Curated annotation (Swiss-Prot), chain A:
Transmembrane segments: none annotated. The modification N6-acetyllysine is found at residue 78. The gene is PSMC5. Belongs to the AAA ATPase family. ATP binds at residues 46-53. Component of the 19S proteasome regulatory particle complex. The 26S proteasome consists of a 20S core particle (CP) and two 19S regulatory subunits (RP). The regulatory particle is made of a lid composed of 9 subunits, a base containing 6 ATPases including PSMC5 and few additional components. Component of a complex with USP49 and RUVBL1. Interacts with PRPF19. Interacts with TRIM5. Interacts with NDC80. Interacts with PAAF1. Interacts, in vitro, with the thyroid hormone receptor (in a thyroid hormone T3-dependent manner) and with retinoid X receptor (RXR). Interacts with ERCC6. This is 26S proteasome regulatory subunit 8. It is found in: Cytoplasm; Nucleus. Component of the 26S proteasome, a multiprotein complex involved in the ATP-dependent degradation of ubiquitinated proteins. This complex plays a key role in the maintenance of protein homeostasis by removing misfolded or damaged proteins, which could impair cellular functions, and by removing proteins whose functions are no longer required. Therefore, the proteasome participates in numerous cellular processes, including cell cycle progression, apoptosis, or DNA damage repair. GO terms for molecular function: ATP binding; ATP hydrolysis activity; DNA-binding transcription factor binding; general transcription initiation factor binding; proteasome-activating activity; TBP-class protein binding; thyrotropin-releasing hormone receptor binding; transcription factor binding. The keyword Membrane does not apply. Its main location: cytoplasm.
UniProtKB/Swiss-Prot annotation, chain B:
This is 26S proteasome regulatory subunit 6B. Component of the 26S proteasome, a multiprotein complex involved in the ATP-dependent degradation of ubiquitinated proteins. This complex plays a key role in the maintenance of protein homeostasis by removing misfolded or damaged proteins, which could impair cellular functions, and by removing proteins whose functions are no longer required. Therefore, the proteasome participates in numerous cellular processes, including cell cycle progression, apoptosis, or DNA damage repair. GO terms for cellular component: ciliary basal body; cytosol; membrane; nucleoplasm; nucleus; proteasome accessory complex; proteasome complex; proteasome regulatory particle, base subcomplex. One of its GO terms (biological process) is proteasome-mediated ubiquitin-dependent protein catabolic process. It comes from the Eukaryota. Transmembrane segments: none annotated. Component of the 19S proteasome regulatory particle complex. The 26S proteasome consists of a 20S core particle (CP) and two 19S regulatory subunits (RP). The regulatory particle is made of a lid composed of 9 subunits, a base containing 6 ATPases including PSMC4 and few additional components. Interacts with NR1I3. Interacts with PAAF1. Interacts with TRIM5. Interacts with ZFAND1. GO terms for molecular function: ATP binding; ATP hydrolysis activity; proteasome-activating activity. Its main location: cytoplasm. It is found in: Cytoplasm; Nucleus. The gene is PSMC4. Keywords: Acetylation, ATP-binding, Cytoplasm, Nucleotide-binding, Nucleus, Phosphoprotein, Proteasome.
From Swiss-Prot, chain C:
SMART domains: ANK (SM00248). This is 26S proteasome non-ATPase regulatory subunit 10. One of its GO terms (molecular function) is transcription factor binding. The gene is PSMD10. It comes from Homo sapiens. One of its GO terms (cellular component) is nucleus.
Amino acid sequence: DSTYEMIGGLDKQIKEIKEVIELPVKHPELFEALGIAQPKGVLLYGPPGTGKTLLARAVAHHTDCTFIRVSGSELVQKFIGRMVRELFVMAREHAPSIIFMDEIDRLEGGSGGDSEVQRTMLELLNQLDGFEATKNIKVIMATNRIDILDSALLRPGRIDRKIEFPPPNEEARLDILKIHSRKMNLTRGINLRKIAELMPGASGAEVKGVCTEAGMYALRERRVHVTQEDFEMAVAKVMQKD
Amino acid sequence: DIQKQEVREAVELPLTHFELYKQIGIDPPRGVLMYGPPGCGKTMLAKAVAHHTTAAFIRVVGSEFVQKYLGEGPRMVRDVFRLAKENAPAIIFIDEIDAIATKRFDAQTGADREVQRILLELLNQMDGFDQNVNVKVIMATNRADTLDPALLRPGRLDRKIEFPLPDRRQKRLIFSTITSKMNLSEEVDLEDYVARPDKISGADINSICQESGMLAVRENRYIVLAKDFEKAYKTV
Amino acid sequence: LMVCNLAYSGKLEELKESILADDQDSRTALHWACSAGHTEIVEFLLQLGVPVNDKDDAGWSPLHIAASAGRDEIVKALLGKGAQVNAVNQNGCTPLHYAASKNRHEIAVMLLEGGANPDAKDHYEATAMHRAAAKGNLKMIHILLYYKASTNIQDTEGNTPLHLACDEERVEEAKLLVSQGASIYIENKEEKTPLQVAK
């Protein structure tokens, strides 16, 4: 589900995005007094914020809409489907929907089939740019990895939305790390404040790096509860690759 | 003294301590990936790990499920996975994944997208069964560029044992575990006979040694010597 | 030949009579005498006057057997008779390579003491310091430094003993070699400095 109880730290950005996404949801009457239309979407460029998808699944979970991705990372690639019209038919039947690519986030064949997917979403943006079947059809890009150059280059911020997202709120390092500590078995004498604030410079992926790279020492010592010293070692275990 | 301890505690410890991972709440990683176009392998480590423990094992040919069937796939992989998690703890060795991990735009070739939906389907089922599944799944490949980012994504394959430059200790190990079953002597030495196949990149070196056993099985010489090694290297 | 069953029988009442009476790869009595590793047999066979530098079809000298088998006294007898300290075999390797691989101190010290070449390279332009460094043999490198051996032996691929020492991740051996003046700027064909190889 990944509701608001599993994502936090972007209060200003959800306060700014409720007018981009939540506008056709609960207050569509401002079309006369304001004169707004359906934009292309929104994207967040920079380091991985450990929850780049939990936000889309969160707003989509509160909008009470379906989540249909394009690349089909989890058994949703051929379930719907020239494999280009079935997505628009399911988008016509299911008017509330949020599209977010996660799997896309050799240069000869990988850019060949990946160039076929890019041409697919380009002609889909041409069909949706020319005509429109129903509302509440918006696409969201993902620029968090290094191999993402087409989405960052083709979206400079001229006819789309752009958000500077290197330093989200420092809660992408602190409070979503606390949330990632709520799921796993957490003790009561831990202080995530210092170990969460003392990881500067490297990247924003310190949450997933310290959790996943700390699971090898919680798997080595076989401790029933995760201690702060495990995360302290995980800081070095993720700073060695820098 | 760290490779055998990391792989040791990453292979034999999670194999019979699932309840302890249920207590601590940490999923044990089991995916071991092999790569490197110069060194083929897939036999020394696959048969070494597949023979360190005297138990059942179920190997699969790279084209074991390619029968252009849409509904037979999940039944085959579900039956193999259920006999592997229910019959006995086996180490499944999936080979030739580059032919089943290729995307295609045209929907007329539904067999390729179907078999990549089978590979991605078991790739999702292994993710949903991370909570102490009773089966080990190792994987090997030679062309990782054609592969999809979902295979090399973390959480699936957390171990990547490469073969760029093995030291002498790995030569004594991977060559002792193969010379222990063959006729050795004081002249049998494969250090230069493995350094040369690194200059001239040759595949399936272990299979070439088996060919040397096929040239030494003629009952003309009991102990295999350098003549069949260098001869098996210059011929095949 | 009859040396395997002769020396394997152990009947002393017929050994010296057998030798004093008169295989597939043309190995004489001295080769198996070095394989077994007995004092009175290499000193008795070499006392009669058997040639000490007999080479087979490939070139495997008996000194590669005494050095590749881990026998001190046999090397003392082969050097006592004046064996080729720098013999050539099928792959060009020297008995110092197998002396450093077996981790035998007396064999290497007594070979280099008699006047052997410390920088005798094989067909791959490699020396025993590659084996002693990659195999973690610290005392072998030390007794190689008792004779002021060279450190800039470039392998046929361009690798130095410092590369094979840093690949083993031996921090003590790396700091020791670099502290003794190892060249940390030699690059192989793969363009990899000795500092990049050490993780």
